[PDB]
C-alpha cells in the first residue's frame, strides 16, 4: 500500500558472484557451536 523505499548501492559490480572474502577456506574449524 505505501511506496516501498529501497537503498541505493553505490558499488559498481554487475556480476552475481560472491566477493573474494567469501571463501570456504577461511572457516575456523571447531567453531563454538551449540549443544545440549
Amino acid at each position: 500500500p505505501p511506496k516501498e523505499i529501497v537503498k541505493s548501492n553505490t558499488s559498481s559490480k554487475k556480476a552475481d558472484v560472491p566477493p573474494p572474502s567469501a571463501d570456504p577456506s577461511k572457516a575456523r574449524k571447531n567453531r563454538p557451536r551449540p549443544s545440549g
Binding site: E4, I5, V6, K7, N9
Partner: protein
C-alpha cells in the same frame, strides 16, 4: 578543552535481517515503522547465495535510521532490555556502538500474532558539533584529530549518563 565539543548521538539505525522477502519481510517492516513512526527503507541482496536461500536484489532486509530526541527514547528503550550492560567490543574505535536484541516486543510494543516476533540490530552513531564539515557539499573537509570521536571518549560517555556498565575486558 571542551566548550562546544560535548558529544551527541548522530543517529540510531535499527536493522532486521531476514532470509527472504514476501510476507515475513513486510511484517518486519511494519515492526520498524510503528517503532520509529517513520516509513522505513528495505535493502536488496547484493548477490545470490542459496545456502541462505537468497538471490541478488531479492529485498532481503529492512532498516530505518533515526535522529534527534526520538532516537534517545528508542535507544534507552532498548538499553533497558540489555539491562544497561554492553561489552568492550560493541564499541568501534571510531567511537560508535551497537547491540542486538531478539524479540522486538521486549521494549514497549504489544504482540499481534498476525505480525510475529523479530529481532533487531540497534546501532548508534556518535559525532560532535562540527559534524557537517565532512557532510555538507561546499568546502567538504575532515574533522581535525582532537575533535574526532574515539572509543575511549565514547565508553566513558556511555559509562556516565545511562549509568550503565561496559563490562568484559
Amino acid at each position: 578543552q571542551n566548550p562546544m565539543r560535548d558529544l551527541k548521538i548522530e543517529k540510531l539505525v535499527l536493522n532486521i535481517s531476514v532470509g527472504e522477502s514476501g510476507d515475513r519481510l513486510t511484517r518486519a517492516s511494519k515492526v520498524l515503522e510503528q517503532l520509529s513512526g517513520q516509513t522505513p527503507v528495505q535493502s536488496k541482496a547484493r548477490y545470490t547465495v542459496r545456502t541462505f536461500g537468497i538471490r541478488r536484489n531479492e529485498k532481503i532486509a529492512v532498516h530505518v535510521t533515526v535522529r534527534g530526541p526520538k532516537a534517545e527514547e528508542i535507544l534507552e528503550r532498548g538499553l533497558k532490555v540489555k539491562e544497561y550492560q554492553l561489552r568492550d567490543r560493541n564499541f568501534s574505535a571510531t567511537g560508535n556502538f551497537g547491540f542486538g536484541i531478539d524479540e522486538h516486543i521486549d521494549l514497549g510494543i504489544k504482540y499481534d500474532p498476525s505480525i510475529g516476533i523479530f529481532g533487531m540490530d540497534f546501532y548508534v552513531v556518535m559525532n560532535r558539533p562540527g559534524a557537517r564539515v565532512t557532510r555538507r557539499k561546499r568546502c567538504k573537509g575532515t574533522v581535525g584529530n582532537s575533535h574526532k570521536t574515539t572509543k575511549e571518549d565514547t565508553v566513558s560517555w556511555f559509562k556516565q549518563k545511562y549509568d550503565a556498565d561496559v563490562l568484559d575486558k
